[PDB]
Amino acid sequence: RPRFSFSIAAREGKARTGTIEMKRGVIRTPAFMPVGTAATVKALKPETVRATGADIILGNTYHLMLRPGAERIAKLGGLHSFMGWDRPILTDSGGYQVMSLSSLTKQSEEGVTFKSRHMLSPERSIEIQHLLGSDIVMAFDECTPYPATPSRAASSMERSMRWAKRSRDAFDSRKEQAENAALFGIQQGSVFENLRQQSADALAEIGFDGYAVGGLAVGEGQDEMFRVLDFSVPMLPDDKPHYLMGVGKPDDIVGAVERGIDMFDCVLPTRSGRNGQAFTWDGPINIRNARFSEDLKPLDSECHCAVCQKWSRAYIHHLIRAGEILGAMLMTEHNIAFYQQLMQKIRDSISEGRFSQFAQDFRARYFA
Amino acid sequence: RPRFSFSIAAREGKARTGTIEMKRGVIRTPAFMPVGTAATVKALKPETVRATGADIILGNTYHLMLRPGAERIAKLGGLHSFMGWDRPILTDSGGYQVMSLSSLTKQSEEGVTFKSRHMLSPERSIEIQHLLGSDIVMAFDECTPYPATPSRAASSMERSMRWAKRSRDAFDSRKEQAENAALFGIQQGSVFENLRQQSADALAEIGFDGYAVGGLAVGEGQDEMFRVLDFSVPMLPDDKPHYLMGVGKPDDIVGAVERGIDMFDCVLPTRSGRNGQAFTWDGPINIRNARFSEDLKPLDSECHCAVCQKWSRAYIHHLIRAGEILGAMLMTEHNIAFYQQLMQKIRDSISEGRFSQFAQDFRARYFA
Numbered sequence: 001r002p003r004f005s006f007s008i009a010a011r012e013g014k015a016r017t018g019t020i021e022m023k024r025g026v027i028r029t030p031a032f033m034p035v036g037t038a039a040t041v042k043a044l045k046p047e048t049v050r051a052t053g054a055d056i057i058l059g060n061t062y063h064l065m066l067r068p069g070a071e072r073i074a075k076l077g078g079l080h081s082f083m084g085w086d087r088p089i090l091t092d093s094g095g096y097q098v099m100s101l102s103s104l105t106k107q108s109e110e111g112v113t114f115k116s117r118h119m120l121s122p123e124r125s126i127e128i129q130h131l132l133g134s135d136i137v138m139a140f141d142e143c144t145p146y147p148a149t150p151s152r153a154a155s156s157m158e159r160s161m162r163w164a165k166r167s168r169d170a171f172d173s174r175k176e177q178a179e180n181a182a183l184f185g186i187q188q189g190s191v192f193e194n195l196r197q198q199s200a201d202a203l204a205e206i207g208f209d210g211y212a213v214g215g216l217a218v219g220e221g222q223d224e225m226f227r228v229l230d231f232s233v234p235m236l237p238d239d240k241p242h243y244l245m246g247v248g249k250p251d252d253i254v255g256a257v258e259r260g261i262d263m264f265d266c267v268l269p270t271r272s273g274r275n276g277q278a279f280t281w282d283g284p285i286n287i288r289n290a291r292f293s294e295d296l297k298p299l300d301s302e303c304h305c306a307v308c309q310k311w312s313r314a315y316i317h318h319l320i321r322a323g324e325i326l327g328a329m330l331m332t333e334h335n336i337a338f339y340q341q342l343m344q345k346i347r348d349s350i351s352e353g354r355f356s357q358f359a360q361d362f363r364a365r366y367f368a
Numbered sequence: 369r370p371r372f373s374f375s376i377a378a379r380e381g382k383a384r385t386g387t388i389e390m391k392r393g394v395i396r397t398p399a400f401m402p403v404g405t406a407a408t409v410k411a412l413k414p415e416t417v418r419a420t421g422a423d424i425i426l427g428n429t430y431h432l433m434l435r436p437g438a439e440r441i442a443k444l445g446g447l448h449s450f451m452g453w454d455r456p457i458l459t460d461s462g463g464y465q466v467m468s469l470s471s472l473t474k475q476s477e478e479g480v481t482f483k484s485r486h487m488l489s490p491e492r493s494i495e496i497q498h499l500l501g502s503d504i505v506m507a508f509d510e511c512t513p514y515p516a517t518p519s520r521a522a523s524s525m526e527r528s529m530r531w532a533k534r535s536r537d538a539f540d541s542r543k544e545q546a547e548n549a550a551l552f553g554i555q556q557g558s559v560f561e562n563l564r565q566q567s568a569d570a571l572a573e574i575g576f577d578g579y580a581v582g583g584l585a586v587g588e589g590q591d592e593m594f595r596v597l598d599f600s601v602p603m604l605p606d607d608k609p610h611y612l613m614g615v616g617k618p619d620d621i622v623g624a625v626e627r628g629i630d631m632f633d634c635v636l637p638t639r640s641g642r643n644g645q646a647f648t649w650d651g652p653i654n655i656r657n658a659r660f661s662e663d664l665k666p667l668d669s670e671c672h673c674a675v676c677q678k679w680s681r682a683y684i685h686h687l688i689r690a691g692e693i694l695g696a697m698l699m700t701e702h703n704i705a706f707y708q709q710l711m712q713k714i715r716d717s718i719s720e721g722r723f724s725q726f727a728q729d730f731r732a733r734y735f736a
């Protein structure tokens with residue numbers, strides 16, 4: 001297999017379906033990436049993640065650099081061996097999380113220093129991702145808070161683009177990395193069209209293997225995110241993957257595919273799983289609700305996951321109410337499976353030229 | 369398969385190996401029973417429990433009667449369907465737990481009433497076990513606290529024996545239960561030989577499918593428990609299973625088999641698993657200890673479990689230190705697997721007439 005090859009096998013409007021071939025495996029697109037904080041997809045064995053249909057998972061520069069340490073994981077053989085996932089891993093660069101989780105920060109042109117004292121810069125971020133043995137490396141960016149004035153949004157975007165160039169060069173500098181991994185740039189600009197264009201252009205000029213749409217999962221309502229996607233994704237190179245970071249709910253995902261996005265990540269299925277929220281084709285339910293205490297149906301009536309073929313709502317209800325680990329396990333497995341079944345339905349419907357009808361049908365039921 | 373058939377296929381000194389055939393399956397003896405509070409073996413899918421080699425698991429009258437409720441589980445189809453375990457289940461009667469976990473109790477000849485207001489009596493305990501669809505029903509007893517004066521120990525034992533007769537008759541009264549399940553009596557008497565004899569005798573006179581040794585897991589040191597086992601187990605009918613309740617550490621188990629016990633249960637492998645204690649043939653280790661942070665070996669060098677073939681100490685160390693659910697999962701799977709491998713080694717060595725040498729060899733290493 002090649003280092004990186006994105007091929008589009010079918011299209012419908014702005015939506016696309018295909019594959020990314022990399023050395024550790026093939027990624028079917030549009031793709032949902034379970035998130036794996038902190039070298040684990042919470043409450044799932046790797047094999048279980050794979051069984052739900054996941055082709056790739058996300059790891060985080062920020063958390064692993066604090067625990068257990070980037071150099072340590074490198075010493076132990078890389079993230080894949082450490083956690084037992086042998087397929088592609090995309091690592092976020094830390095750009096977001098450093099500002100999100102740190103107890104104290106100092107931002108500067110050089111990078112960000114923080115307490116949880118550490119510095120994170122384009123160079124270090126790319127080095128950490130290297131040490132982890134990431135397959136898809138993210139540029140070190142700044143995720144602009146929402147809302148943002150045009151001035152501050154512009155300043156932030158410009159910095160991110162300078163950091164994008166520094167990320168590129170740091171990646172290319174490391175032969176082993178350049179030859180075996182891929183590098184994705186990250187578009188910023190808040191919700192402003194001219195800034196998103198200048199950002200798209202700076203990224204394309206630098207050149208990346210894929211293009212992420214940053215900053216649209218930090219407060220924007222769906223209508224606003226969709227409006228920004230409407231003009232923003234066509235700015236990106238058509239022949240490269242389009243990754244919407246941090247999105248999202250099943251309906252976010254469907255609308256974003258309708259707008260040209262090929263890759264997604266979100267903690268919602270996992271986190272909300274452990275809190276008792278289960279996704280269904282008729283909308284999300286809270287399994288803790290009293291009305292499920294003697295409900296013998298599965299979580300969802302059509303889901304093929306192992307959880308739905310074996311246990312009832314009533315049981316899972318009991319587990320979560322009891323704070324039992326197996327509840328978290330079952331809820332999470334179901335939710336990730338559901339997300340993967342959604343992606344398959346999306347891929348298949350685009351392949352067959354009936355995606356717009358799928359999206360309409362999905363919405364009708366999900367929102368009923 | 370018959371309702372109940374215990375056959376002894378080989379012996380060595382007081383130790384025995386064989387099988388219990390029941391309608392839902394065969395139990396290899398000596399047997400370790402993972403404990404399944406509250407309709408779950410914590411952090412394991414049923415299938416995972418089975419894969420470690422478990423033939424039967426323990427459920428608890430006390431906890432399930434409070435949550436989710438005995439009648440409710442009966443409504444939903446019985447404990448086996450509810451939790452997805454289709455093999456034998458032994459249910460404890462509540463005798464122990466009511467006094468152990470309840471917030472307020474009133475003991476009387478009729479039974480125990482408690483707040484966590486509920487009453488538990490021989491009749492209700494047996495009815496609850498029925499409702500759950502238990503395969504091996506335990507008599508409702510009183511687990512005498514340790515230490516105990518001879519007077520109080522005698523009074524407690526006598527009550528337990530009256531309750532044993534009431535348990536027997538309540539069980540026999542329910543045709544469905546009498547025909548498909550088994551009933552085990554429970555010997556009490558504290559550490560006193562004459563009381564253990566009177567108890568053994570009252571139990572044998574009543575007649576049960578198996579005989580448990582109660583009250584030896586509530587403070588007694590090993591030397592004392594072994595001394596009491598030394599005279600107590602020969603008092604029980606030889607041709608019926610001998611169950612030591614609540615025991616124990618791997619070395620407890622080996623010494624108790626040496627004294628004629630065929631069945632064990634304990635929360636140690638599960639609970640201590642989640643707290644970071646892993647069993648090894650060289651003794652238990654605490655995986656949280658700093659010295660495991662870059663240790664690439666498996667939990668144990670010889671263990672065949674899935675955990676030891678796939679993940680390192682270093683990873684599991686990281687998980688538990690991070691309070692990750694997958695740490696609890698992996699630790700628990702390993703620990704139960706280890707317990708089952710111990711039981712297999714015991715069964716095989718008795719079958720081959722080299723159990724006394726196994727026990728000596730085990731102790732030498734484990735205590736090295």
Ligand SMILES: N#Cc1c[nH]c2nc(N)[nH]c(=O)c12
Binds near residue numbers: 097218
């Ligand atoms: N919005 C949003 C984001 C979610 N994850 C992100 N990660 C990075 N590196 N940048 C981003 O803007 C975001």
Ligand SMILES: N#Cc1c[nH]c2nc(N)[nH]c(=O)c12
Binds near residue numbers: 506511554584
């Ligand atoms: N010792 C001890 C025991 C552990 N579980 C028990 N369960 C019952 N019913 N009785 C017992 O004495 C004990």
Ligand SMILES: [Zn+2]
Binds near residue numbers: 307308309337
């Ligand atoms: Zn499901």
Ligand SMILES: [Zn+2]
Binds near residue numbers: 668675677705706
């Ligand atoms: Zn193991």
